Every structure is written in structure tokens, then in C-alpha cells.
Design an enzyme around this catalytic site. Structure first.
Site, PDB file in Angstrom:
ATOM      1  N   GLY A 234      -5.465  -3.628   1.170  1.00  0.00           N
ATOM      2  CA  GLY A 234      -4.082  -3.925   1.514  1.00  0.00           C
ATOM      3  C   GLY A 234      -3.832  -5.375   1.871  1.00  0.00           C
ATOM      4  N   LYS A 235      -4.384  -6.291   1.077  1.00  0.00           N
ATOM      5  CA  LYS A 235      -4.286  -7.714   1.378  1.00  0.00           C
ATOM      6  C   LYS A 235      -3.129  -8.367   0.638  1.00  0.00           C
ATOM      7  CE  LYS A 235      -8.542  -8.223   0.118  1.00  0.00           C
ATOM      8  NZ  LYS A 235      -9.959  -8.632  -0.059  1.00  0.00           N
ATOM      9  N   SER A 236      -3.107  -8.243  -0.688  1.00  0.00           N
ATOM     10  CA  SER A 236      -2.014  -8.810  -1.468  1.00  0.00           C
ATOM     11  C   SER A 236      -0.698  -8.079  -1.221  1.00  0.00           C
ATOM     12  CB  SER A 236      -2.376  -8.783  -2.948  1.00  0.00           C
ATOM     13  OG  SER A 236      -3.592  -9.465  -3.186  1.00  0.00           O
TER      14      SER A 236
ATOM     15  N   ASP B 209      -5.036 -15.484   0.219  1.00  0.00           N
ATOM     16  CA  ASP B 209      -5.406 -14.104  -0.073  1.00  0.00           C
ATOM     17  C   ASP B 209      -6.699 -14.109  -0.868  1.00  0.00           C
ATOM     18  OD1 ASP B 209      -5.540 -11.458  -1.529  1.00  0.00           O
ATOM     19  OD2 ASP B 209      -3.726 -11.135  -0.342  1.00  0.00           O
TER      20      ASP B 209
HETATM   21  N1  LIG Z   1       1.313   0.155   4.187  1.00  0.00           N
HETATM   22  C1  LIG Z   1       1.313   0.502   2.883  1.00  0.00           C
HETATM   23  N2  LIG Z   1       2.153   1.441   2.404  1.00  0.00           N
HETATM   24  C2  LIG Z   1       2.159   1.794   1.107  1.00  0.00           C
HETATM   25  N3  LIG Z   1       1.332   1.248   0.201  1.00  0.00           N
HETATM   26  C3  LIG Z   1       0.438   0.299   0.554  1.00  0.00           C
HETATM   27  C4  LIG Z   1       0.373  -0.139   1.945  1.00  0.00           C
HETATM   28  N4  LIG Z   1      -0.587  -1.077   2.012  1.00  0.00           N
HETATM   29  C5  LIG Z   1      -1.095  -1.226   0.764  1.00  0.00           C
HETATM   30  N5  LIG Z   1      -0.474  -0.411  -0.092  1.00  0.00           N
HETATM   31  C6  LIG Z   1      -0.776  -0.290  -1.525  1.00  0.00           C
HETATM   32  O1  LIG Z   1      -2.130  -0.649  -1.759  1.00  0.00           O
HETATM   33  C7  LIG Z   1      -2.234  -1.097  -3.105  1.00  0.00           C
HETATM   34  C8  LIG Z   1      -3.321  -2.147  -3.223  1.00  0.00           C
HETATM   35  O2  LIG Z   1      -3.326  -3.027  -2.106  1.00  0.00           O
HETATM   36  P1  LIG Z   1      -3.713  -4.556  -2.394  1.00  0.00           P
HETATM   37  O3  LIG Z   1      -3.953  -5.293  -1.106  1.00  0.00           O
HETATM   38  O4  LIG Z   1      -2.774  -5.096  -3.439  1.00  0.00           O
HETATM   39  O5  LIG Z   1      -5.138  -4.408  -3.101  1.00  0.00           O
HETATM   40  P2  LIG Z   1      -5.971  -5.736  -3.423  1.00  0.00           P
HETATM   41  O6  LIG Z   1      -6.444  -6.205  -2.072  1.00  0.00           O
HETATM   42  O7  LIG Z   1      -7.072  -5.268  -4.338  1.00  0.00           O
HETATM   43  O8  LIG Z   1      -4.966  -6.650  -4.076  1.00  0.00           O
HETATM   44  C9  LIG Z   1      -0.864  -1.616  -3.510  1.00  0.00           C
HETATM   45  O9  LIG Z   1      -0.460  -1.026  -4.746  1.00  0.00           O
HETATM   46  C10 LIG Z   1       0.063  -1.216  -2.380  1.00  0.00           C
HETATM   47  O10 LIG Z   1       1.233  -0.556  -2.872  1.00  0.00           O
HETATM   48 MG   LIG Z   2      -5.180  -8.650  -4.193  1.00  0.00          MG
END
Ligand SMILES: Nc1ncnc2c1ncn2[C@@H]1O[C@H](COP(=O)(O)OP(=O)(O)O)[C@@H](O)[C@H]1O
Ligand SMILES: [Mg+2]
Ligand SMILES: CC(=O)O[C@H]1C(=O)[C@@]2(C)[C@H]([C@H](OC(=O)c3ccccc3)[C@]3(O)C[C@H](OC(=O)[C@H](O)[C@@H](NC(=O)c4ccccc4)c4ccccc4)C(C)=C1C3(C)C)[C@]1(OC(C)=O)CO[C@@H]1C[C@@H]2O
Ligand SMILES: Nc1nc2c(ncn2[C@@H]2O[C@H](COP(=O)(O)OP(=O)(O)OP(=O)(O)O)[C@@H](O)[C@H]2O)c(=O)[nH]1
Ligand SMILES: Nc1nc2c(ncn2[C@@H]2O[C@H](COP(=O)(O)OP(=O)(O)O)[C@@H](O)[C@H]2O)c(=O)[nH]1
Ligand SMILES: [Mg+2]
Lengths: 356, 441, 434
Positions: free
Chosen positions: A100-102, A251
Site C-alpha cells: 500500500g505504498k503507491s 516511493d
Molecule cells: N486503504 C486501502 N483501501 C483500499 N485499497 C487499498 C488500500 N491500500 C491499498 N489499496 C490497494 O492496494 C493495491 C496495491 O497497493 P500499492 O501500494 O499500489 O502496491 P505497490 O506498493 O506494489 O505499488 C492498490 O490497487 C490499492 O487499490
Molecule cells: Mg508501487
């Protein structure tokens, strides 16, 4: 000079994911305030960790739901006041693949992150005090670390088979490390920086893997520079003294174990590089934590490009904040614990911030 | 008939294997060309024992063996040696380059490209076997091939074959001697991956065998050829009842049962008592009492650990030759009378016994004497925890500073994999402690 | 299956190579016309490592000779072992670097490196599985520094999953042989620290002390210095060509010698060495060879290990030996001299044994050490560097060829950071509880 800061710490918990609902994993991460407790599934022991802020975005039903704008107004807005005060600023994430970083820093279209909020809020903050006594200037770039190499994402390209132009790092004996040829484009309105951002994220390297369908094969650093010209009482030339503030929003990629998410070819190389980079970063934090214990330690910066350009953004002259991200599933115990341990270490880093 | 497959991974495994197959060829009458000369008097039979050798119609005996090193030197010493015409030409140098003493290369970068072929050959072997009874894996904690490739192979075999006894013969890292700076890491990662798949890991150390060859055989300058020939005998004592006739025969499952109380404490130590020169073969009686007490002397153990700093959870004594059961009864009674040999309260019956009628063979050019009695002791004790602790401490001293890690991460590994492993070993240490606490209502 | 490319840049490189091939041929039984006239059959099992078959049981080296002065190439051709090289691998120009790193890196080397890279690609693509590269190059001049580092960078960019090794003659403390050694060395270090995996640091004054004390030679030419260096080069790659009881290769040494990537600068050494008369008064056993190996007065690096602590050492023995005495002796070295080693590495000694010794010795030994005393070299350069750079003493011959001062400051910073990374591990401090 004379300042004495701390590298602040925020800690988010994401919701259950698709895989984590396919395999019915239980809850192991729990929040009781700013203290977060994680205990094993086998009831071995219970670890608890103290932090500066925590954000339980697990379920929309809970009290104190820490949505995007809470995270923003708790981290960026203080950092924005410091950036307007005459400091450089840095906010860097850390976590597992898919943790959940990006979603936090940049975010999705219907729920923006800190970047589309930081830029807009500083535009507004300028709109309230852009006098003819004090004027403002903004430029930026948005660059990427991919396989040891720097790339500029705000670069329109023609159609090619071979078009990805890597830049170089250099060391200025005063300013410190920097990038050679990083297009710093002027940004005088929110539509401009939005167009730049969507030109960038569409260029960032991604690919589908087991843990994310759109994963990040790179690190991303967002370089937003703000100068402000001010006048002091002199009967000669006025609008005479400048105050600069460089914003670095970072990020990172994940850890990418090859058994949980099997890869071959390019998808494997990136992983290696990513992991290597992260390892060095850990050392830095650990070593800088030892500097808080008064021990004579040498901080390795040069082993990677990430820890080299952000040298001044960990020690040096900027106010820096860390965001750890974790998952509630009982699988990711070791990765979660390594994350929280590195955050506990980063909590203890001091930084001597310069007033510009 | 009963059949077992040997897998000699690594330099160490191959050298142990060459010694072992020399020994078996001598025991059974096979020449290095595979051609038995005395089957002309037998006309078939089973003295060309199917536990190890498969027979053709042309009279050629081929070992049920597989050889992997991930480097060309060692197996090419076989293809150009005395036994070049024995082994099937499928000895597997697919190793254009080695693992550089990196489990990450041995388990992921070059763990793959070669294992499919290894498994296909094992499949071809096992289809030729009716009564497949177990695997014997020769390797070494300390390198990459003999750590990572062995881990991966055991993982695959626990899937493709399942409930088949997978015994290991491993070189344990010594406390003082070491030929590498990164043996702790590899050892810990291997014990992490293997401990959920292996059934009994027979551990040896080289310092121990050096001291044995010095004090007893009187070799002041020994090398590995002088060492592995002892190890071979241990296997020949473990694999005797499957070949020769006896009074108390011990199949492989009997080890897995009697020496492994709990599924994570399957690390017994090996010992061979009558290690005597031909000079000291005279001047001595070599009775069962003497050998059985020598097996319990801490100075004659093949792993540098003191049982006196611990307790015995089990012991399997495999006898060979002119041995009568009364002598063993008397000997074990003498040991149970001795107070320096303390057992756990939860094992009053701590001794397993096996008697074969076939004495050991004397390898020409060896250092051991011809004997009428031989004994192999396989003992599970709580002492080895101390050894494990040493390794773990070493791990810490480097993992604190993240030394030699970028070679592992650089070849497909996450750093968390280290921490995980350490935790398991810590638990294992605790488990050992938990089995030393005497029982109270 | 484990093939090595040799690159030779400059006088030092070409002259060490002329001796190194002269030695490998003597080991493998190749005559000056490329033909095999040896006795043992192990010499041909792994001839592929350094050579290639051509037509008539002739074996041509996998070498590349580089210079910007013809006089060093003719010397090879007009030599004993010159007619074995591929003449299409002599890549030379004219009007050399002029003791200028700039001319060899940016101006003249930029107009010649493409040919060298073509030869490199041709010789690499002919390999079944290449292990790494091997550059013999001096730093203290131009070509060997600049053109060398440039080739290193470009090979690392083309071939990053391989080993890049350098046998480098560094400047000496007392007497200079080029007046602009500091700049060039600092810049070549800036380039090597970031691209190599293990570099072997050599110093001519150490080898003079060896020739004088041990070998009792009074008129040592460079063919004698290079004779010692070739011995080392051979020994590093012995367990790929011949068989042994405990094998090693460049990757295994590197994994066991580089804890952190940047500290890949090593002290080489080789045992036995004695005067021609004093060989009848000496027994050749593992103890004597170890006593000679770990002696400060047998290193080629001009840096006393007694002024530091060994991070990690490596012993590549050659001969019929017992492993008991090896392990015992190395343990004894660690215990008796505990202060000159680190505590946070339990065993600092890598071992390797090959059963096939050199042509006239019953046993031999090669020593690769990684110690903090190497700082005493770089620090010196840095001092020299600033003493010139504070005044801009010889810079315009570097700026005139397309450079800037930022490069100099970068190089100095990198070198001093490395010095500090070496310094942090020689203070034998005690923790709070341990
Ligand atoms: N609090 C949240 N509520 C709903 N979805 C979440 C939440 N946090 C993260 N996500 C979901 O998690 C998925 C991936 O998180 P992300 O940080 O983008 O992964 P990465 O770190 O690989 O980029 C996203 O598609 C996002 O919609
Ligand atoms: Mg990412
Ligand atoms: C028969 C005999 O006992 O004479 C020895 C000899 O006296 C000594 C001194 C030899 C001799 O070497 C030297 O004296 C010497 C002179 C200048 C610089 C370096 C060495 C010898 O010349 C050198 C030569 O060594 C070899 O031949 C090795 O194979 C060597 N290769 C070559 O010397 C060589 C060079 C060019 C062409 C052909 C062969 C070697 C070393 C390391 C790795 C591979 C090969 C030998 C045994 C001797 C003499 C001849 C006296 C020594 O050689 C080496 C490097 O080990 C020097 O110290 C050893 C100890 C030997 O006792
Ligand atoms: N007992 C015994 N031990 C050996 C023998 N050969 C090597 N060893 C041990 O093995 C360890 C080295 O690891 P190896 O088994 O050689 O690793 P490897 O199988 O060669 O794998 P790589 O590192 O990739 O080459 C050393 O610590 C030795 O003590 C042998 O013949 N007998
Ligand atoms: N050990 C050794 N070093 C040498 C030899 N010849 C030259 N050197 C060193 O290498 C340097 C020569 O530099 P070089 O590259 O030939 O300059 P260039 O001709 O302009 O390219 C000198 O500074 C010497 O210190 C040799 O035969 N042996
Ligand atoms: Mg090996």
C-alpha cells in the site's frame, strides 16, 4: 545551523487483499493508538512497537479511519510549513510488495495521494500570500531508479525500438549529490503539474506479478523545487534575498521473494536490484541510528544510487519522514517485522536542517 | 528386491561416493568395469546385490547412483578414472559454472536448469526398482551445491515420492577448522529448508576424523582420501542388512523410527570404534565390550561435541561379524551401569541392536586393519545443540553488519529469508532444551 | 566452460602478459609456434580456459593487446612467444596518452576502443560459458589507466554478470616514475571501485625488497618483477585448469573475500621463493610456506598488515598436501595473531588445494589478502593529490582534453570514503556486553 530534528515515522495498515481473501488469513496486526501490536499466528509471543503516527485503513467501519487526507494533513502539511519556512523536505515510503505504498504518496484517480495534495495545497498557500513584496518560482522533475540507472519520467519521446535514456549522478562539493540533465520544468499552475504527473506515472516501469497486477519495478523520487524572493529593508536593490526549498517525495519498490511471486527474465533482474538497493538503505538507517548512540560509524551511501542522491535527505540538511506500510494477513510476519524494525531504527535518526 | 538410491551432491559427496562404491564393489565382487567374474559359478542369484547394482543381460552391473556438482572437475575425474566404465554415462555435469559458496546460486540461479534432468534420471532409476526403500543423500553444509541444490532436491522428492525415507549424510561445520567464511549462513539456510523434508541426517565433522586418524591409526598427515574410507564403512554398516544375512536385521525405517522421537530432532551422530592400524590390530582382543565402549568414548566420536555436556535420547548399535547377542547384552548393561552416560528419563529403553554376519572388507591401499568384529554407533544426543548455538552466534556476528549478503541477494534472495532461518534454529535449540527437562507430574 | 579473456594495456600490461603467457604455455605445454609438446594429459583437458584451437592442433591465446605506441607491440612480435598471438588482436594507435588519463579515456582512447570491443565480442561469443575478464594495467600513466578503465566500464555494461579482475601496479611511496601519478591513480580508482569485483594491487618497491632480501638478486630487471606477478596470476586461476581436493574459482574467492562490494582491493603474494643456494637448506612444507605467506616482507602491496587487521585472506595451495596441516596452520595463524584479524568474522581464511603443482616445485602457494593497511596507499595519493590540486599544478593538460574539476573532487571523495570504510574496521573496540 544549530537545528536538531528527528526523522519522523508514520505507519499504515492496508486492507485484506484478493489473495488474502482467497486464502482465509486471520488478523495479526492490531492498532491501539500510536502503538501497534503484532503477534504470531501460533501464539508464540507478542511484539509491540511505538511510533509517531499510525493509520488503520483496514475497514471503513472502524473509529479513527485513517483515510488519504488524514495521512496528508498529518505528514505533508507540517512538512509544507517547513518547506515554506525555508527548509528542504523529504518523505519516503517503505514496505512489502503490495503493502500500500503507491496508494499513499501518489494514489489513484478517485483518491489522490500526498503528491496531488501537496502540490495543490502549496499552490493555494502561494495564492494567499503572493504579494509584490514576496514572489514565488516553481520547477520540478520526477525521476526513477531502475536497474541501477536513473531515468527522467517527464520526457516526451518519439516512436522507437531503443528509447530510454539513462542519466548520471555527480557530486557537487557544496550542494552534494545531484543528477546530470534532469529536466526541471517550470510549474505555475495545478493543471501543469497534473499533466506532468500523468506524463510521469504513465512512463514509470511496471509489470504484472503474483502479488500485484500493476507492480512497481522501480523507485520514484518526486523533485519539486520552490524558490521565493523576498525583500528586506535596504534602500538599494530590493526583492534581493532568496529562500529555496526542495521537496523529495519517494516511493520505493517491494522486497520480491521469488517463491511467493515466481519470475524469469527481466522481471527477475529488477527484483535483485530492488532488493540490493533496499538492503543498503537498511544499513544506512541502522548506522545512523548508531550515530544517535554516539558511536563512531561510517554510513554507506555510495553502494547504491538511491542512498547516494538522498544522502542529504537522511542526514544532511532536510526534514525527512518515513512511511512504513504493512498488511493484516498472518502470512507477512517476517516482512512486516523487518519493516517495523527498520522504522523503529529510523525513528531515532536526527538531522541538522539548514535554514535557507 | 529392496532398492535404495544414492545421490552424491557436491565435491564432498562425490568423493565419499567414489570411496563407497569402491567399498561396495569389493564387498560384492564387482570389478570397475561392472563385470562380475564369479557369476559363472552362480548363474544368476542375488549376490550381485540389487540394493545398489542393477544387472543387465550382458552381465554388467550398474550402480543406482546420481552425481551432481555444478562444476566439471570432480565428475570428469570419474569419467577418466578407474570406474569410468561402471557408471551410466549420465553423470550430470550441466555445471558450466558453480555456486561460489552461495546457497542463493545453488538454490535459485543454478538450482534451476539442472534439477529437471536430475529428477528425470531419478525417475528412470526408480521405475527400474520394485521395492524402492529410501534415498541416501551425501552432501556438505558449507558450500552452495551441497546446501542449496540438496535443499531443492529434497523439496522436489518430498512431492514426487513422498513417504520414502530420505536419509542424509552431511559434513557438519567444525568449530575451529573451516575452509570458507560463509559456512554459517549456508548451514542455517539448509537446515531450515531440509528439516521439514529429511527423516534422519547423519552428521560428521572432519576435525574429529583427523584426531581419530592421528590418535588411533597414527596418520600425522591425513587427507580426505584417508577420511572418507571411514565414512564409507558407516554406510556399509547402515546398508548391510539389506544385502547380507544376519540375526537382527535393520531395515532403513528402523532408524527413522528409533532415533527420531520428535520430527525436528533427527540429527544423530555417527561413530566407528575399531579404527586400528594393522600394528594395533595385534596387541588387542577386539571383543564386543571393547568396541562398544570405544563407541561411547567422547574422543572417538565423529562430531566434535561432548556427550557428557548433555544426555542421550537414543543409540543404535549395528554389529558386524563374529558377534553373539549375549556379548551385546552384557556390554549395554555395562554402559547402563556407568554413570557418565546419562539418558533421558523418557527413554528407559534406549538401545537398538543389529547383528550381521558379514564382516567388513579391507579396501586395498587403506589404513584400517582386517577385523572379525565391527561396530557402528548412531547416537542422538542433546549435546549437538551447543554446536548449533556456535553456528547461530557466528551468523549473528555477520548478519549484524550484513556482510556477504549482497552475493545472496544479488543471486535471487530476500534478506528476510535469513532472519526466518535463524528463528527456526533458535526454536530448534529450545526444542533440544525442552527434551532435556526431566518429567514431573 | 570457464573461459577467461585477457586484456593488456600499456607497457606494464603487455610486458606482464608476455611473461604470463610464457608461463601458462610452460604449464600447459604449448611451444612458441602454438603447438602442444607436453607430457601429461591434464594440460589439454582445460586448455579452453586461456586458449583456442585453430586448425592443426595449434592453440592461440584468448588475448587482446592494447596500446597507443607501436613499440610495445613490436616487442611482443620480436620476442620468443610472439608468433602465437592473433595479429588481428593487436589494436594500437600512435601518439600515446602522454601520462594523461584524459587522452586515454576521452580523446584518443575514444577513437580506438571500438576496435577493442569488437575483438572482445568476437572472443567472448566464441566461448561456451565465459567466467570473467583479466586486465593487466599500470596506473600512474595514461593508456593503462584511462583506456583500461574505459574498457572496464564498457565490459561491465555489456557483461555485468561476469567477473572483472585487474592486476594493477600502483604508485610507490618513495620514488615516482611519473610526475602526474596521483591524479591518474585517483581517477582510475574512481573508475575501478565502482566496476571491478576484485583488483590486485602491486607495487614495484615491494618486489624490489623481495628480489633483494629473499631471492638475493642484486640486478633485478622488470622481467623478474613480472615473473613474480605472473606466478600470482597463474595461482589465482589454478583450480579451473587443474583438479584438486578443494576447488575454488574467481567467484568463490570473491564471495569469500569481498564482504562489502567496495573493499575489493587485495595484497597478492606467492610462496616458495629463495636464493638459488639457499634451497638446499630449507624444507618445503606447509608450515614454511605459511610462514612466508603471512610475512609482511613477502607482500607485493607495500603496506604492512601489522598496521591493520586482515578482513579476509585466501590461500590457494598447489601440490600433494594433507588438509589437516593446512587447516591446523591457518587456525594457528588466526589464534597466535588474533589482533591482526577481525572478531566479527570467525574464520577469515579461505582454502583451496590443487593436486597439480608447477613444473619444478613439489608444492606452491598463492596468497590473496584483504586488509585495512591498503588505506596507507590511497591516503598518500590523496595527500599528494591535494598538494597539487590546491594549486592546479598540472591540470590544464587535463582540462584541455575535455574534463572538469568536478571529476577530480568526485574521485578524491570516493577514495577518502573508501579510506574511511577501511579505517572503521581496524579499531579493535569492545562492545558493552559482547
Ligand atoms: N486503504 C486501502 N483501501 C483500499 N485499497 C487499498 C488500500 N491500500 C491499498 N489499496 C490497494 O492496494 C493495491 C496495491 O497497493 P500499492 O501500494 O499500489 O502496491 P505497490 O506498493 O506494489 O505499488 C492498490 O490497487 C490499492 O487499490
Ligand atoms: Mg508501487
Ligand atoms: C629446478 C629448481 O629447483 O630451480 C628452481 C629455483 O631455484 C627457484 C629459486 C625458482 C626460480 O625462480 C627464480 O629464481 C625467480 C627469479 C626472478 C623472479 C622470480 C623467480 C627458477 O628460476 C624458476 C623455476 O620455477 C618454475 O619453473 C615454475 O614453473 C614457474 N615458472 C617459471 O619459472 C617459468 C617462467 C618462464 C618460462 C617457463 C617457466 C612458475 C611459478 C608459478 C606459477 C607457475 C609457474 C624453478 C623451479 C627454479 C628456477 C628455474 C631456478 C623460484 O621460482 C618461483 C617463482 O617459484 C624462485 O623462487 C622459487 C624457488 C625455486 O627454488
Ligand atoms: N569429509 C569430507 N569433506 C569434504 C570433502 N571435500 C570437501 N569437503 C568439505 O566440504 C566443504 C566445502 O563445501 P563443498 O562440499 O566442497 O561445496 P561444493 O559441493 O563443492 O559446492 P560449490 O561451493 O558450489 O563448489 C569443506 O568445508 C570441506 O570440509 C571430502 O572429500 N571429505
Ligand atoms: N611492474 C612493472 N611495472 C611497469 C613496467 N613497465 C612500466 N611499468 C609501470 O607502468 C607505467 C607505464 O605507463 P604506460 O601506460 O606505459 O604509459 P604510456 O606508454 O604513455 O601509455 C610506469 O609508471 C611504471 O610504473 C614493468 O615492466 N613492470
Ligand atoms: Mg565444488
Amino acid at each position: 545551523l544549530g537545528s536538531n530534528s528527528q526523522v519522523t515515522v508514520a505507519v499504515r495498515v492496508r486492507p485484506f487483499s484478493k489473495r488474502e481473501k482467497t486464502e482465509k488469513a486471520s488478523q495479526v496486526v492490531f492498532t491501539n493508538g500510536e502503538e501497534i501490536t503484532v503477534e504470531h499466528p501460533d501464539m508464540k509471543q507478542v511484539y509491540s512497537f511505538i511510533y509517531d503516527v499510525s493509520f488503520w485503513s483496514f475497514d471503513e467501519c472502524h473509529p479513527g479511519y485513517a483515510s488519504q487526507t488524514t495521512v496528508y494533513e498529518t505528514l505533508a502539511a507540517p512538512l509544507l510549513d517547513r518547506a515554506f519556512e525555508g527548509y528542504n523536505t523529504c518523505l519516503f515510503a517503505y514496505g512489502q510488495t503490495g503493502s500500500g505504498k503507491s496508494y499513499t504518496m501518489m494514489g489513484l484517480n478517485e483518491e489522490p495521494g500526498i503528491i496531488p495534495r501537496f502540490c495543490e495545497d502549496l499552490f493555494a498557500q502561494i495564492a494567499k500570500k503572493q504579494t509584490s513584496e514576496v514572489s514565488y518560482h516553481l520547477e520540478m522533475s520526477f525521476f526513477e531508479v531502475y536497474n541501477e540507472k536513473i531515468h527522467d519520467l517527464l520526457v516526451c519521446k518519439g516512436e522507437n525500438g531503443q528509447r530510454k535514456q539513462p542519466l548520471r549522478a555527480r557530486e557537487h562539493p557544496v550542494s552534494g549529490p545531484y543528477v546530470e540533465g534532469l529536466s526541471m520544468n517550470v510549474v505555475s499552475s495545478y493543471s501543469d503539474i497534473q499533466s506532468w504527473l500523468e506524463l510521469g506515472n504513465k512512463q514509470r516501469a511496471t509489470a504484472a506479478t503474483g502479488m500485484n497486477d500493476k507492480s512497481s519495478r522501480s523507485h520514484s523520487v518526486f523533485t519539486l523545487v520552490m524558490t521565493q524572493t523576498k525583500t528586506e529593508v535596504v534602500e538599494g536593490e530590493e526583492h534581493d534575498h532568496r529562500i529555496t526549498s526542495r521537496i523529495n517525495l519517494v516511493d520505493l519498490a517491494g522486497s520480491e521473494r521469488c517463491s511467493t511471486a515466481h519470475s524469469s527474465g527481466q522481471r527477475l533482474k529488477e527484483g535483485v536490484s530492488i532488493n540490493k538497493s533496499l538492503l543498503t538503505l537498511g544499513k544506512v538507517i541502522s548506522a545512523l541510528s548508531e550515530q544517535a548512540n554516539g558511536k563512531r560509524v561510517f554510513i554507506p551511501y555510495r553502494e547504491s544510487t538511491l542512498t547516494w542522491l538522498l544522502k542529504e535527505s537522511l542526514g544532511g540538511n532536510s526534514k525527512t519522514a518515513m512511511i512504513a506500510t504493512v498488511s493484516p494477513a498472518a502470512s507477512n510476519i517476517e516482512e512486516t517485522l523487518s519493516t517495523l524494525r527498520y522504522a523503529t531504527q529510523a525513528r531515532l535518526i536526527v538531522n541538522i536542517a539548514k535554514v535557507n | 528386491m529392496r532398492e535404495c538410491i544414492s545421490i552424491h551432491v557436491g565435491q564432498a559427496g562425490v568423493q565419499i561416493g567414489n570411496a563407497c562404491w569402491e567399498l561396495y564393489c569389493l564387498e560384492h565382487g564387482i570389478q570397475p568395469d561392472g563385470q562380475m567374474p564369479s557369476d559363472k559359478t552362480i548363474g544368476g542369484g542375488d549376490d550381485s546385490f540389487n540394493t545398489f547394482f542393477s544387472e543387465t543381460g550382458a552381465g554388467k552391473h550398474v550402480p543406482r547412483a546420481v552425481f551432481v556438482d555444478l562444476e566439471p572437475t570432480v565428475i570428469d575425474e570419474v569419467r577418466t578414472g578407474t570406474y569410468r566404465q561402471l557408471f551410466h554415462p549420465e553423470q550430470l555435469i550441466t555445471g558450466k559454472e558453480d555456486a561460489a559458496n552461495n546457497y542463493a546460486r545453488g538454490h535459485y540461479t543454478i538450482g534451476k536448469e539442472i534439477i529437471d534432468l536430475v529428477l528425470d534420471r531419478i525417475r528412470k532409476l526408480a521405475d527400474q526398482c520394485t521395492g524402492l526403500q529410501g534415498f541416501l543423500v551425501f552432501h556438505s553444509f558449507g558450500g552452495g551445491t551441497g546446501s542449496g541444490f540438496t535443499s531443492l532436491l529434497m523439496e522436489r522428492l518430498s512431492v514426487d515420492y513422498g513417504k520414502k525415507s530420505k536419509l542424509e549424510f552431511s559434513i557438519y561445520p567444525a568449530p575451529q577448522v573451516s575452509t570458507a567464511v560463509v559456512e554459517p549462513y549456508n548451514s542455517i539456510l539448509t537446515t531450515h529448508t531440509t528439516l521439514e523434508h529429511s527423516d534422519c541426517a547423519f552428521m560428521v565433522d572432519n576435525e574429529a576424523i583427523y584426531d581419530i586418524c592421528r590418535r588411533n591409526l597414527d596418520i600425522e598427515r591425513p587427507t580426505y582420501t584417508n577420511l572418507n574410507r571411514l565414512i564409507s564403512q558407516i554406510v556399509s554398516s547402515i546398508t548391510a542388512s539389506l544385502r547380507f544375512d544376519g540375526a537382527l536385521n535393520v531395515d532403513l525405517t528402523e532408524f527413522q523410527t528409533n532415533l527420531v522421537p520428535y520430527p525436528r530432532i533427527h540429527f544423530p551422530l555417527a561413530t566407528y570404534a575399531p579404527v586400528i592400524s594393522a600394528e594395533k590390530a595385534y596387541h588387542e582382543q577386539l571383543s564386543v565390550a571393547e568396541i562398544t565402549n570405544a563407541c561411547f568414548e567422547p574422543a572417538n566420536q565423529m562430531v566434535k561435541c561432548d556427550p557428557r555436556h548433555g544426555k542421550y535420547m537414543a543409540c543404535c548399535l549395528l554389529y558386524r561379524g563374529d558377534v553373539v547377542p549375549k556379548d551385546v547384552n552384557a556390554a549395554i548393561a555395562t554402559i547402563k551401569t556407568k554413570r557418565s552416560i546419562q539418558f533421558v528419563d523418557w527413554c528407559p529403553t534406549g538401545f537398538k541392536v543389529g547383528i550381521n554376519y558379514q564382516p567388513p572388507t579391507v579396501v586395498p591401499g587403506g589404513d584400517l586393519a582386517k577385523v572379525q568384529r565391527a561396530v557402528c554407533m548412531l547416537s542422538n544426543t542433546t549435546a549437538i545443540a551447543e554446536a548449533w548455538a556456535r553456528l547461530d552466534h557466528k551468523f549473528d556476528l555477520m548478519y549484524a553488519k550484513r556482510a556477504f549478503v549482497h552475493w545472496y541477494v544479488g543471486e535471487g534472495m530476500e534478506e528476510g529469508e535469513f532472519s526466518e532461518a535463524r528463528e527456526d534454529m533458535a526454536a530448534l535449540e529450545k526444542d533440544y532444551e525442552e527434551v532435556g527437562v526431566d518429567s514431573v507430574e | 566452460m570457464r573461459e577467461i579473456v585477457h586484456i593488456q594495456a600499456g607497457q606494464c600490461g603487455n610486458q606482464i602478459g608476455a611473461k604470463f603467457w610464457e608461463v601458462i604455455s610452460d604449464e600447459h605445454g604449448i611451444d612458441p609456434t602454438g603447438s602442444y609438446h607436453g607430457d601429461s594429459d591434464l594440460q589439454l583437458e582445460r586448455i579452453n580456459v586461456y586458449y583456442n584451437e585453430a586448425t592443426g592442433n595449434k592453440y592461440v591465446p584468448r588475448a587482446i593487446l592494447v596500446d597507443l605506441e607501436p613499440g610495445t607491440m613490436d616487442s611482443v612480435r620480436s620476442g620468443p612467444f610472439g608468433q602465437i598471438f592473433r595479429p588481428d588482436n593487436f589494436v594500437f594507435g600512435q601518439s600515446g596518452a602522454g601520462n594523461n588519463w584524459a587522452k586515454g579515456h576521452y580523446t584518443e582512447g575514444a577513437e580506438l576502443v571500438d576496435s577493442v570491443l569488437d575483438v572482445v565480442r568476437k572472443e567472448s561469443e566464441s566461448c561456451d560459458c565465459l567466467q570473467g575478464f583479466q586486465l593487466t594495467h599500470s596506473l600512474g600513466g595514461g593508456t593503462g589507466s584511462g583506456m583500461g578503465t574505459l574498457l572496464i566500464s564498457k565490459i561491465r555494461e555489456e557483461y555485468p554478470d561476469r567477473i572483472m579482475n585487474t592486476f594493477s601496479v600502483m604508485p610507490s611511496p618513495k620514488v615516482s616514475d611519473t610526475v602526474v601519478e596521483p591524479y591518474n591513480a585517483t581517477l582510475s580508482v574512481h573508475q575501478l571501485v565502482e566496476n571491478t569485483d576484485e583488483t590486485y594491487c602491486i607495487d614495484n618497491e615491494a618486489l624490489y625488497d623481495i628480489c633483494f632480501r629473499t631471492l638475493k638478486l642484486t640486478t633485478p630487471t622488470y622481467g623478474d618483477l613480472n615473473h613474480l606477478v605472473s606466478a600470482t596470476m597463474s595461482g589465482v586461476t589454478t583450480c579451473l585448469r587443474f583438479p584438486g581436493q578443494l576447488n575454488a574459482d574467481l567467484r568463490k574467492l570473491a564471495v569469500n573475500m569481498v564482504p562489502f562490494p567496495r573493499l575489493h582491493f587485495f595484497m597478492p603474494g606467492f610462496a616458495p621463493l629463495t636464493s638459488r643456494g639457499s634451497q638446499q637448506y630449507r624444507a618445503l612444507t606447509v608450515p614454511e610456506l605459511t610462514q612466508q605467506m603471512f610475512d609482511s616482507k613477502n607482500m607485493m602491496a607495500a603496506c604492512d598488515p601489522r598496521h591493520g587487521r586482515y578482513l579476509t585472506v585466501a590461500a590457494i595451495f598447489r601440490g600433494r598436501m594433507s588438509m589437516k596441516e593446512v587447516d591446523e596452520q591457518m587456525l594457528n595463524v588466526q589464534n597466535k595473531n588474533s589482533s591482526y584479524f577481525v572478531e566479527w568474522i570467525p574464520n577469515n581464511v579461505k582454502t583451496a588445494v590443487c593436486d597439480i603443482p608447477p613444473r619444478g616445485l613439489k608444492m606452491s602457494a598463492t596468497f590473496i589478502g584483504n586488509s585495512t593497511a591498503i588505506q596507507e596507499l590511497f591516503k598518500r595519493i590523496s595527500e599528494q593529490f591535494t598538494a597539487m590540486f590546491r594549486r592546479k599544478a598540472f591540470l590544464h593538460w587535463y582540462t584541455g582534453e575535455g574534463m572538469d574539476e568536478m571529476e577530480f573532487t568526485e574521485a578524491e571523495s570516493n577514495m577518502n570514503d573508501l579510506v574511511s570504510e577501511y579505517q572503521q574496521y581496524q579499531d579493535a573496540t569492545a562492545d558493552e556486553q559482547g
